[PDB]
């Protein structure tokens, strides 16, 4: 049977790769020594439970708002006027205990199988051990009750307004409960600043009755049992062997299961894949080559004509080495057709290239994982684009492909000029007679972009619709064909843009933002069947600036 007790997972052993607790039973649980806490039963022997100080108990932290990274990876749809959807995390910890184990004798069943395997130096056998008993034991861990909530805002603007609205009306109440207050009360009203806000919570261990920051209507509880939150320290199970012969042989079998998919031995830095780990094309397949997830840049919203993309390097610390990232891109309108092919190594770092595409490599969250990025600066406005990415290892395997599809923004529209043209056109149509008027009316309407034409229509109909609609009146004064040529131009504007271009007012802000521009100093030595490691390529990185003109849409000019 399964011996379960509180604190709990400390005595059972932990796998690093699969991240699972309760893997076999490493240490024995006994009840000779008398360890109690509060309302909890008798603790197992040799584990030290220390409640965290009153400063840490029932404290909540609101994170800074950031774009929703989940919504920047696939088919990327978001309102251009809104911007990136934002998320903000709220987290409250309540029933906290720090749990260490010292000192405990080994389990009966653990030492039995440890006695028989010690002499029996076998690979398939040592892996079956790790499957059952895991790789480490947990040394230090944090238990308690945490409520983690995520507030999903539809835009960066909508938050800022709500945060400032909250900050005015509070100066008592947490930000999340103020929002939840207005969310639940909205059954009384309808559309407002809070329209698209959503809160999503996930609890690990139920909220105690005493703590008021994690209280949710039905779910309160008197003295809840603490749940594992963090694993602070792990120690490998080869510490427990007590002899130099087996604990070296076990260690190498552990490294095989972690780094080389259990189908190969690890030489310093790389996996020697035993045959036939090798794939369909006969290339070493024991170390996994992961899918690189192509993302939109969180800090740079794509404009019309300008898109910048990111991805985190898929290279493990040990095993596979990535030699290149292949990045294809096309404009759709097609399907299953190949876009312009770009080798990161060869086309983006080495061959210009510029000033339309630029690439960059940078140090990530915690080094050393690299953050590759590429920026497209000569794309076409109101266009749907598909970008795909895959990695290529040192021996020539491709990774699983990854995709991003997105629309570039609407083209810029001088809204003053549009309303001016509309009046010019109306006064010509009230002039009637002249063939110069007719020609010059037709010329000015055709000379300006389709979006501008759609906007002059919007204005023309706002004012002069009672005396004849824009198309109808264009047909009367310019004749059947010229009016149909005008009409057709308006068809070239998309559904998204035509919606946005019916706004009350359009204004133009100009953001100016930095991007990393890197070039290859050193052309690296490549073989026929093996290639050079991309990460080792010496590069010279310079910061540059893009100016990004955007339209700003609204029902009035006060934002
Ligand atoms: C869970 O589970 C598990 C448990 O355990 C875990 O696992 C782990 O992990 C970790 C992390 O990742 C790891 O660690 C790591 O490792 C790695 C690898 O290592 C190895 O190898 C290497 C290599 O080398 C090379 O080079 C050299 C020169 O010097 C030579 O010698 C050699 O040879 C090589 O080469 C190669 O080979 C050949 C030739 O012959 C050919 O093929 C070619 O050439 C190639 O290349 C090394 O280095 C090492 O070594 C070590 O050890 C030994 C014994 O064993 C000794 O003898 C030595 O001395 C050493 O030691 C020392 O040093 C080192 C360094 O410094 C250190 O570490 C130590 O401590 C001592 O001191 C081995 O063998 C590595 O690489 C890494 O490192 C890195 O990273 C870090 C962080 O982490 C840092 O700090 C450092 O610095 C580095 O960095 C660098 O690099 C990188 C890479 O790429 C980059 O990126 C950066 O930038 C820089 O530059 C580490 O260390 C481990 O191992 C593992 N373990 C096991 C058992 O498995 C996991 O993790 C977990 N998980 C979680 C927690 O999550
Ligand atoms: O020492 P160099 O000039 O870089 O070249 C090495 C050489 O081409 C080896 O044949 C190759 O192993 P395989 O061709 O057998 O894969 C090795 O890969 P490795 O160092 O990643 O094992 C290369 O690094
Ligand atoms: C349960 O604990 C006993 C010690 O009383 C131990 O002998 C037994 O093997 C444990 N069960 C498992 C599955 O480890």
Author numbering: 717 to 887, 897 to 1058, 1063 to 1288
What does the paper say about this structure?
Although we verified that the expressed protein had remained intact such that EGF repeats 2 and 3 (EGF-2 and EGF-3) were present in the crystallized protein, they were not resolved in the structure, presumably due to disorder, though small-angle X-ray scattering (SAXS) data indicate that the domains are folded. The crystal structure contains density consistent with an inositol triphosphate species being bound in a shallow pocket formed by loops from EGF-4 and the β-hairpin slung across the Fn(III) domain. The Fn(III) domain (β12–β15, π1, β16–β19 with the start of β16 and the end of β19 tied together by a disulfide bond) follows directly on from EGF-4 and has the unexpected feature that it is complemented by a 54-residue β-hairpin from the ASTN-2 C-terminus (β20–β21) that folds across the Fn(III) β-sandwich, clasping the edges of both sheets. An annexin-like domain is an unexpected feature of the ASTN-2 structure (α6–α11) which despite undetectable sequence homology with annexin itself superimposes very well on an annexin single repeat (see electronic supplementary material, figure S9 for a superimposition).
Our focus here is on a PLP especially identified as being involved in neurodevelopment, astrotacin-2 (ASTN-2). ASTN-1 and ASTN-2 have been shown to interact directly with each other in vitro in a calcium-independent way with multiple regions of each protein apparently contributing to their interface. Thus, the endosomal regions of ASTN-2 comprise a smaller N-terminal domain and a larger C-terminal domain whose structure we report here and which we refer to as its endodomain.
